[PDB]
């Protein structure tokens, strides 16, 4: 048990993902939103999401969270699953988390290739997600993905 691993405890116990929303960001239409926290770690998240998605150039999100404990550089790795294997991948960095603030994040997502249809893709997606403050790794949560 090293000093790291007991302040990335604490980074996650004081740790909330209020609400969150997807949209095209050229309707700037929503496509999903949500009020589970989908960052907690150890349980696969189920989430339902338009099949129009897949057809967006990029996507939009709105990211709404707390936390009580301070944060130098906070920062997320993004990775789309398909049975197994990584397909896509992200890095997003907030930055500097003010102690016992609630802040919301915009980013914008782009798709780099092409999309199997949605009806293959539908239940075999996994996204995951790593919460880092810098070089400190916080969480991994998952989530898997139904297209409507
Ligand atoms: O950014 C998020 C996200 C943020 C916090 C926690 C889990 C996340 N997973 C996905 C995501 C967002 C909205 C709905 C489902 C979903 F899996 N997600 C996402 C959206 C687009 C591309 C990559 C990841
Ligand atoms: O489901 C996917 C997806 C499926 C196969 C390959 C890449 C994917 N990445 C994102 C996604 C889809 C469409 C446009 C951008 C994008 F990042 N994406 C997605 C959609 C909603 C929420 C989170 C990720």
Not at 108 to 129: R, Y
């Given at each position: 048990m090293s000093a790291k691993d007991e302040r990335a405890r604490e980074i996650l116990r004081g740790f909330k993902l209020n609400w969150m929303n997807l949209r095209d960001a050229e309707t700037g239409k929503i496509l999903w939103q949500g009020t589970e926290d989908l960052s907690v770690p150890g349980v696969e998240h189920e989430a339902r999401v338009p099949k129009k998605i897949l057809k967006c150039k990029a996507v939009s999100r709105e990211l709404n969270f707390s936390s009580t404990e301070q944060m130098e550089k906070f920062r997320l790795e993004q990775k789309v699953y398909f049975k197994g294997q990584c397909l896509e991948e992200w890095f997003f960095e907030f930055g500097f988390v003010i102690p016992n603030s609630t802040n919301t994040w915009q980013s914008?997502?782009?798709?780099?290739?092409?999309?199997?249809?949605?009806?293959?893709?539908?239940?075999?997606?996994?996204?995951?997600?790593k919460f880092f403050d810098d070089d400190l790794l916080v969480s991994t949560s998952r989530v898997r993905l139904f297209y409507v």
């Open positions: 914008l997502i782009e798709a780099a290739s092409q999309m199997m249809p949605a009806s293959v893709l539908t239940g075999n997606v996994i996204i995951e997600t």
